[PDB]
C-alpha cells in the first residue's frame, strides 16, 4: 500500500517535471524557425504524453 502510494506520488511528480521541461516556444513570429520549433515541441509533448500514460498504467493494473 504505502510503498506503491509513495512510488505513484514520485512517478506523478516526475511526469509533471517532464511537462515543465517542455515549455512552449516564445517568438510567435514566422520565420521558418518558429514553425520548426513548434513541430519539435509537438513531437516532444506527444512523447511525454505516451510515457506518462504508460508509467501510470503500471499503477492501475
Amino acid at each position: 500500500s504505502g510503498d506503491s502510494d509513495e512510488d505513484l506520488l514520485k512517478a506523478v511528480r516526475l511526469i509533471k517535471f517532464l511537462y515543465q521541461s517542455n515549455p512552449p516556444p516564445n517568438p510567435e513570429g514566422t520565420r521558418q524557425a518558429r514553425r520548426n520549433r513548434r513541430r519539435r515541441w509537438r513531437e516532444r509533448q506527444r512523447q511525454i504524453h505516451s510515457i506518462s500514460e504508460r508509467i501510470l498504467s503500471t499503477y492501475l493494473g
Partner: antibody
Amino acid sequence: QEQLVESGGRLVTPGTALTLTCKVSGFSLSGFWLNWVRQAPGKGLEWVGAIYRGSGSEWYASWAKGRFTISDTSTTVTLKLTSPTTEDTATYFCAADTTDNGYFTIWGPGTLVTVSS
Amino acid sequence: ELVMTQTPSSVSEPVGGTVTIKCQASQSISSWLSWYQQKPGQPPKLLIYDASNLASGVPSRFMGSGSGTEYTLTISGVQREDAATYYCLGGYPAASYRTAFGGGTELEII
C-alpha cells in the same frame, strides 16, 4: 561527444561505506535517466537503480533499496554503497538513456568493487 | 517486481545458422524492451530498442520482435564475431514494477 566514466572501485571490508562516481560529459540533453548496472564476476547484468538528472527522482530495484543511494551532481552521478557485503562484489557500470524511452545507449567502461572479509 | 525470464542459458550454432533468444515478461511492458550484446572485458552494446527497432551501427542480421508478454531476438546469419553473451532489458525505472535484465544467453559459434 557523449561519454560516461566510472571511478571509485576499490577492495573493501564488509560494512565499509563506499561511493562510486559516474563522470557525465558531452551530453546536449539537460534531463535524462542515468542508470546503475552491476555484474558479479562470471554472472549476468543487474539493474541497481537510476536518477532522472534534471530532478531528484531516484528509482531503486527491490533488493537495492536501503543499501544503495544514487545522488545527482552538476557534472556527476554517484552511487553510495551504505553497508556492502560479499554479495556486492561486482563491476559497476553507469548507463545513460538518451531518449527517455527506457533503453541504454551510452555505457561507461565499469569500475570493479571487491567486498572481502 | 518485474522479472524477465531469458531462455536458453547457452546456445551453440554454426556460421550462417539462425539463433533464437526469448524473454518472457512477468508484467505487461509493451515496447519497453531492448537487447544487448556483451563480449568479455567490455561493457554491453545496444542491438534492439522499442522491442523491434534496429539500433544504429548494428548488422541487419539482428532482429527483434514482441507479442504481448513474449519477446524474441533473432540473429539470422550468425557470424564468428557474434560469439558473446546476450541480455534483454524490460520495463521502465519509474514503472510500478521497475526495470530488469534477463539472466542472459551465452552464444558459442561452431
